[PDB]
Ligand binder design. Structure first.
Ligand SMILES: NC(=[NH2+])NCCC[C@H](N)C(=O)O
Ligand code: NA
Ligand code: NA
Ligand code: NA
Ligand code: NA
Ligand code: NA
Length: 190
């Protein structure tokens, strides 16, 4: 169903839906690993489905329709603790590449494309443990897509060769993120 922000479990999968308090987002859980998000003039939000906790060797399957009109991402997205990390394997994005301004550290080839690798830092921002300073790890796919599989270990291995180490996994989902934009998406995870 359509829900307010929160986390939980639906039809065998973990879900997380977060927003910054602005209006405009409709997040709906569906059967199985399905979710839908429609946004009209949102602020910042993140929603999707997957697992609590994730693993360092999961092969994640996704498919569906992704139609951003402005700044948005479609990603494998999750967190670790000790160290506290927010990470992204970005499969598609709208008008804004999330790595803009960031220092490139390397490349990895996985699941039919090269990805470029970046680290960023978030200072005194929201996190899974409350306000915190933490690093973000990014793999950004050069060839955008709306369905496929992601061998997460290929990314996690490549990040570790640049000192981008992960802690104990927290959640791991396929997420749609938007930032002061509009769009529509409907995705099935497995
Ligand atoms: N990329 C983002 N917008 N991240 C939002 C993180 C939200 C954070 N985990 C919280 O529960 O407050
Ligand atoms: Na974007
Ligand atoms: Na995303
Ligand atoms: Na991949
Ligand atoms: Na995770
Ligand atoms: Na996200």
């Amino acid at each position: 169903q359509t829900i307010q922000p929160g986390t939980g479990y639906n039809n065998g999968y973990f879900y997380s839906y977060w927003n910054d308090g602005h209006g405009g987002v409709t997040y709906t859980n569906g059967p199985g690993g399905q979710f839908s998000v429609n946004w009209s003039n949102s602020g910042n939000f993140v929603g999707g489905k997957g697992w609590q906790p994730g693993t360092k060797n999961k092969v994640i399957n996704f498919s569906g329709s992704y139609n951003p009109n402005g700044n948005s991402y479609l990603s494998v997205y999750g967190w670790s603790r000790n160290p506290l990390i927010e990470y992204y394997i970005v499969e598609n994005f709208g008008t804004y590449n999330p790595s803009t301004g960031a220092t490139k550290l390397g490349e990895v080839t996985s699941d039919g494309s090269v990805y470029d690798i970046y680290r960023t830092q978030r200072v005194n921002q929201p996190s899974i443990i409350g306000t915190a300073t933490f690093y973000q790890y990014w793999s950004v796919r050069r060839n955008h897509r709306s369905s496929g599989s992601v061998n997460t270990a290929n990314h996690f291995n490549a990040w570790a060769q640049q000192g981008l180490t992960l802690g104990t996994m927290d959640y791991q989902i396929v997420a749609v993120e938007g930032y002061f934009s509009s769009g529509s998406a409907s995705i099935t995870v497995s």
